[PDB]
Amino acid sequence: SKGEELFTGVVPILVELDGDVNGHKFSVSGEGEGDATYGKLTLKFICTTGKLPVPWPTLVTTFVQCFSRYPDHMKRHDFFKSAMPEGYVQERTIFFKDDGNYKTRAEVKFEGDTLVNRIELKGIDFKEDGNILGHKLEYNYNSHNVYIMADKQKNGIKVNFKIRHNIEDGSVQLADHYQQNTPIGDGPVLLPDNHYLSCQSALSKDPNEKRDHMVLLEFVTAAGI
């Protein structure tokens, strides 16, 4: 595959997000590297506007599935890498149960040797004292499966999954994800058969970082075929 070759080694990653949740505006910058051979991602995110108005875990999914490890026997189903270097647009609506929703639009593409994820996020209908704006979510992350289906109509894919964020009282805050990806270029891409990505994420802090931030270590592997 075309893009396939772009991911054989360690690739630097840059993430830039501008967000507005219920009028609370903020920006985040992230840097790190991905090693698709091992489905590995290592990144550090910094809120460059001061304090993040929402819990960091709620932004993990928004912050480059092209770094997922696709088993050799499943390479023909790797839409993400096939869209590179031109990239793909990734759009989501994330519904937080009994609370508001995030709508995101992002462009993932290479800028030189760096894989960049530029995101615009808009959140509305949140409860000021809810689990999100109220900061009631634990700083951790559960393993989840991400379900992918082709969408030949748009020469792209449809993705859906549920993220369960742990609330400090022991309960869970469901975040229902509806996602669509379509190529940026007019080039050809690989439309996959149904499969899923198995994802695990570990959140941590940089003991010397005084800015509001998040350190992320993530491993993702395609499966189901």
Contact at 8 Å (CB) between 101 and 93? yes
Q: What resolution in angstroms, rounded to 1 decimal?
A: 1.6
186 burial level (CB within 10 Å; 0-12, 13-18, 19+): exposed
Contact at 8 Å (CB) between 69 and 218? no
Q: Which two tokens stand for residue 205?
A: 């802090």
Find the helix or strand (DSSP H, E) in which 222 lies. Answer: strand 213-223
Contact at 8 Å (CB) between 203 and 148? no
The DSSP secondary structure of 91-110, one letter per residue, reads EEEEEETTS-EEEEEEEEEE
Domains of the chain as residue ranges with CATH: 1-225 (2.40.155.10)
Q: How was this structure determined?
A: X-ray
Contact at 8 Å (CB) between 225 and 73? yes
Written as one letter, the residue type at 101 is N
Look at strands 213-223 and 195-204 and give their pairing: antiparallel
Closest by Cα among 222, 162, 221, 218 to 192: 222
